[PDB]
Design an enzyme around this catalytic site. Structure first.
Site, PDB file in Angstrom:
ATOM      1  N   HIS A  46       0.808  -1.218   0.000  1.00  0.00           N
ATOM      2  CA  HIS A  46       0.000   0.000   0.000  1.00  0.00           C
ATOM      3  C   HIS A  46       0.838   1.264   0.000  1.00  0.00           C
ATOM      4  O   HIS A  46       1.437   1.633   1.014  1.00  0.00           O
ATOM      5  CB  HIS A  46      -0.930  -0.007   1.240  1.00  0.00           C
ATOM      6  CG  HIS A  46      -1.869   1.131   1.380  1.00  0.00           C
ATOM      7  ND1 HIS A  46      -1.491   2.373   1.799  1.00  0.00           N
ATOM      8  CD2 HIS A  46      -3.194   1.243   1.116  1.00  0.00           C
ATOM      9  CE1 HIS A  46      -2.514   3.188   1.805  1.00  0.00           C
ATOM     10  NE2 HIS A  46      -3.578   2.531   1.401  1.00  0.00           N
ATOM     11  N   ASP A  47       0.821   1.910  -1.159  1.00  0.00           N
ATOM     12  CA  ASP A  47       1.260   3.264  -1.385  1.00  0.00           C
ATOM     13  C   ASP A  47       2.750   3.410  -1.048  1.00  0.00           C
ATOM     14  O   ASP A  47       3.149   4.427  -0.495  1.00  0.00           O
ATOM     15  CB  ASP A  47       0.421   4.288  -0.618  1.00  0.00           C
ATOM     16  CG  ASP A  47      -0.973   4.487  -1.162  1.00  0.00           C
ATOM     17  OD1 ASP A  47      -1.325   3.783  -2.137  1.00  0.00           O
ATOM     18  OD2 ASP A  47      -1.718   5.353  -0.617  1.00  0.00           O
ATOM     19  N   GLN A  76      -1.178   6.004  -6.322  1.00  0.00           N
ATOM     20  CA  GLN A  76      -1.764   7.209  -6.843  1.00  0.00           C
ATOM     21  C   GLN A  76      -1.048   7.574  -8.139  1.00  0.00           C
ATOM     22  O   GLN A  76       0.153   7.377  -8.248  1.00  0.00           O
ATOM     23  CB  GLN A  76      -1.688   8.421  -5.919  1.00  0.00           C
ATOM     24  CG  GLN A  76      -2.624   8.261  -4.718  1.00  0.00           C
ATOM     25  CD  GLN A  76      -2.706   9.521  -3.882  1.00  0.00           C
ATOM     26  OE1 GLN A  76      -2.410  10.615  -4.376  1.00  0.00           O
ATOM     27  NE2 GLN A  76      -3.122   9.355  -2.627  1.00  0.00           N
ATOM     28  N   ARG A 104      -9.119  14.863  -7.641  1.00  0.00           N
ATOM     29  CA  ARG A 104      -8.679  15.089  -6.264  1.00  0.00           C
ATOM     30  C   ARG A 104      -9.846  15.205  -5.278  1.00  0.00           C
ATOM     31  O   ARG A 104      -9.760  14.700  -4.159  1.00  0.00           O
ATOM     32  CB  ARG A 104      -7.829  16.362  -6.200  1.00  0.00           C
ATOM     33  CG  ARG A 104      -6.952  16.560  -4.987  1.00  0.00           C
ATOM     34  CD  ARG A 104      -5.932  15.427  -4.843  1.00  0.00           C
ATOM     35  NE  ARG A 104      -5.074  15.604  -3.677  1.00  0.00           N
ATOM     36  CZ  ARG A 104      -4.259  14.675  -3.172  1.00  0.00           C
ATOM     37  NH1 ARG A 104      -4.111  13.450  -3.673  1.00  0.00           N
ATOM     38  NH2 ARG A 104      -3.535  14.986  -2.095  1.00  0.00           N
ATOM     39  N   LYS A 163      -4.694   4.159  -7.188  1.00  0.00           N
ATOM     40  CA  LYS A 163      -5.177   4.550  -5.870  1.00  0.00           C
ATOM     41  C   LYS A 163      -5.819   5.944  -5.966  1.00  0.00           C
ATOM     42  O   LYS A 163      -5.134   6.858  -6.462  1.00  0.00           O
ATOM     43  CB  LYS A 163      -4.064   4.578  -4.845  1.00  0.00           C
ATOM     44  CG  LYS A 163      -4.532   4.924  -3.437  1.00  0.00           C
ATOM     45  CD  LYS A 163      -5.336   3.782  -2.828  1.00  0.00           C
ATOM     46  CE  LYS A 163      -4.944   3.353  -1.458  1.00  0.00           C
ATOM     47  NZ  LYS A 163      -4.838   4.484  -0.517  1.00  0.00           N
ATOM     48  N   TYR A 169       0.013   5.095   5.058  1.00  0.00           N
ATOM     49  CA  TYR A 169       0.219   5.353   6.468  1.00  0.00           C
ATOM     50  C   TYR A 169      -0.706   4.468   7.280  1.00  0.00           C
ATOM     51  O   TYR A 169      -1.854   4.263   6.917  1.00  0.00           O
ATOM     52  CB  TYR A 169       0.053   6.838   6.793  1.00  0.00           C
ATOM     53  CG  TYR A 169       1.119   7.623   6.028  1.00  0.00           C
ATOM     54  CD1 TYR A 169       2.471   7.655   6.312  1.00  0.00           C
ATOM     55  CD2 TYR A 169       0.666   8.373   4.966  1.00  0.00           C
ATOM     56  CE1 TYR A 169       3.331   8.436   5.522  1.00  0.00           C
ATOM     57  CE2 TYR A 169       1.502   9.135   4.178  1.00  0.00           C
ATOM     58  CZ  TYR A 169       2.849   9.162   4.462  1.00  0.00           C
ATOM     59  OH  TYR A 169       3.582   9.945   3.608  1.00  0.00           O
ATOM     60  N   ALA A 170      -0.204   3.874   8.367  1.00  0.00           N
ATOM     61  CA  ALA A 170      -0.976   2.869   9.098  1.00  0.00           C
ATOM     62  C   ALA A 170      -2.390   3.297   9.464  1.00  0.00           C
ATOM     63  O   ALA A 170      -3.345   2.553   9.215  1.00  0.00           O
ATOM     64  CB  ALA A 170      -0.243   2.445  10.372  1.00  0.00           C
ATOM     65  N   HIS A 171      -2.554   4.500  10.017  1.00  0.00           N
ATOM     66  CA  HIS A 171      -3.852   4.866  10.578  1.00  0.00           C
ATOM     67  C   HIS A 171      -4.779   5.422   9.502  1.00  0.00           C
ATOM     68  O   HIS A 171      -5.970   5.554   9.762  1.00  0.00           O
ATOM     69  CB  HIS A 171      -3.732   5.836  11.771  1.00  0.00           C
ATOM     70  CG  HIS A 171      -3.572   7.278  11.405  1.00  0.00           C
ATOM     71  ND1 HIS A 171      -2.403   7.774  10.848  1.00  0.00           N
ATOM     72  CD2 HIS A 171      -4.419   8.318  11.494  1.00  0.00           C
ATOM     73  CE1 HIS A 171      -2.563   9.081  10.622  1.00  0.00           C
ATOM     74  NE2 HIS A 171      -3.784   9.461  11.024  1.00  0.00           N
ATOM     75  N   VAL A 172      -4.266   5.699   8.319  1.00  0.00           N
ATOM     76  CA  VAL A 172      -5.132   6.243   7.251  1.00  0.00           C
ATOM     77  C   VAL A 172      -5.362   5.164   6.207  1.00  0.00           C
ATOM     78  O   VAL A 172      -6.219   4.283   6.473  1.00  0.00           O
ATOM     79  CB  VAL A 172      -4.555   7.536   6.678  1.00  0.00           C
ATOM     80  CG1 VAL A 172      -5.513   8.204   5.674  1.00  0.00           C
ATOM     81  CG2 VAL A 172      -4.177   8.531   7.790  1.00  0.00           C
ATOM     82  N   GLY A 173      -4.700   5.141   5.052  1.00  0.00           N
ATOM     83  CA  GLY A 173      -5.119   4.217   4.005  1.00  0.00           C
ATOM     84  C   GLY A 173      -5.000   2.740   4.334  1.00  0.00           C
ATOM     85  O   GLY A 173      -5.767   1.836   3.925  1.00  0.00           O
TER      86      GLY A 173
END
Ligand SMILES: CCCCCCCCO[C@@H]1O[C@H](CO)[C@@H](O)[C@H](O)[C@H]1O
Ligand SMILES: CCCCCCCCO[C@@H]1O[C@H](CO)[C@@H](O)[C@H](O)[C@H]1O
Lengths: 207, 207
Positions: B37-38, B78, B87, B122, B151-155
């Site tokens: 992821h990203d 992305q 966006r 993405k 980022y762990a807490h977001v995507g």
């Protein structure tokens, strides 16, 4: 079995306790839907009465304003007695879930839906998941979502993220939601204010 | 402009620091996809080098095992230079976002995709959002998701919730993810372990 812990009474947050919003959206009634998230008897029973009372009184004031103002009301509600396949991986954290009986699945009387209100079946954390909420919002020309109900850090927040993701501006009503603890509630507000919503109190909405 | 704060070095969590899993899922290679992821240059540049290094070394060990074991690899990325309409509401918290130049949008060399790996575009926090990830997983008969990246807490966490919601068992690799701070990372792990995933270390995955 339920996944829902023992809940200790805590005060709903006040305007002064809210995290700062980083977004700058402004609620317009003509654009908005009020989502009454999972305000069913089964989900409110674990709340201590003081917390249930404060929650429902704010959610009710919010709902009357919305109605006075032309905001579309919508309710999510789990069907109850989900089969094993319908339940899927909810089982592993939350058990078989509520029954399909009125005593579990009814929306609490103080928030009784009216005949113009949308009724959505709730399957997973997000209100949009396997529902027609998004399609209905598009078809009504509404692109703002006001959220109230339970539990703040689980379905309410994930519903907020989904709306945001769909470029629907969300408004999370900080004292018309409740949660497992004050710390869970507060963290949901912090997450919303910096990642997916405007956080506001019921008074602020009513102006 | 970016939405991404100054990030202070912190140690990746060890097995002993992990919250207890409440689920009891067990990863089977034949069932699984690894979601990278990203892991793009633009998202890793804010990390202090010590944290970037630890992250990428674990993600790389994870990816080699997955490849040795028959796990399907998938990358989200992305596109860069999103137009204003593309966006949408990302703009309000994260700015116009990365450019479509190699210096921003490339997957970091240490995780270079191979020709059998799925490449997903993405768009929003979740990897499933406006992507064919779910349809591809169904069509490959894979119903488990192993997650790494930022980022762990977001995507990462929202991708985890979406997989879970679709009755895909997720496995969140606690030391092959990174975040804005240790406290954000830890809270993501706590949320995952009690609401949507098995949390595991890279060593635990490799057995
Ligand atoms: C499980 C996810 C837990 C995360 C809860 C907090 C999420 C929002 O965290 C916010 O991060 C900002 C940096 O981006 C900080 O400036 C804020 O002070 C903090 O509230
Ligand atoms: C923004 C969302 C922040 C919430 C972070 C923590 C989410 C998981 O919170 C967990 O709740 C369980 C009760 O259900 C407790 O028993 C656990 O100790 C706690 O880690």
């Amino acid at each position: 079995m339920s996944g829902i812990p023992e809940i200790t009474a805590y005060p709903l947050p006040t305007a002064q306790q809210l995290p700062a919003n980083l977004a700058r959206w402004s609620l317009e009634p003509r654009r908005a839907v009020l989502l009454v998230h999972d305000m069913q008897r089964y989900f409110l029973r674990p709340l201590p009465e003081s917390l249930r009372a404060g929650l429902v009184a704010n959610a009710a004031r919010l709902r009357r304003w919305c109605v006075e103002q032309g905001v579309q009301i919508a309710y999510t509600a789990q069907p109850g007695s989900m089969t094993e396949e319908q339940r899927g991986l909810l089982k592993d954290f939350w058990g078989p879930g509520m029954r399909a009986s009125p005593a579990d699945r009814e929306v609490v009387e103080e928030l009784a839906p009216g005949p113009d209100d949308w009724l959505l079946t709730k399957w997973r954390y997000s209100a949009f998941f396997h529902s027609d909420l998004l399609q209905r919002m598009r078809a009504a020309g509404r692109d703002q979502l006001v959220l109230c109900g339970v539990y703040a850090h689980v379905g309410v927040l994930i519903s907020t993220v989904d709306a945001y993701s769909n470029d629907i501006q969300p408004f999370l009503v900080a004292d018309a939601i409740a949660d497992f603890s004050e710390a869970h509630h507060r963290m949901a507000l912090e997450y919303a204010a910096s990642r997916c919503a405007m956080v506001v109190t019921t008074d602020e909405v009513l102006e």
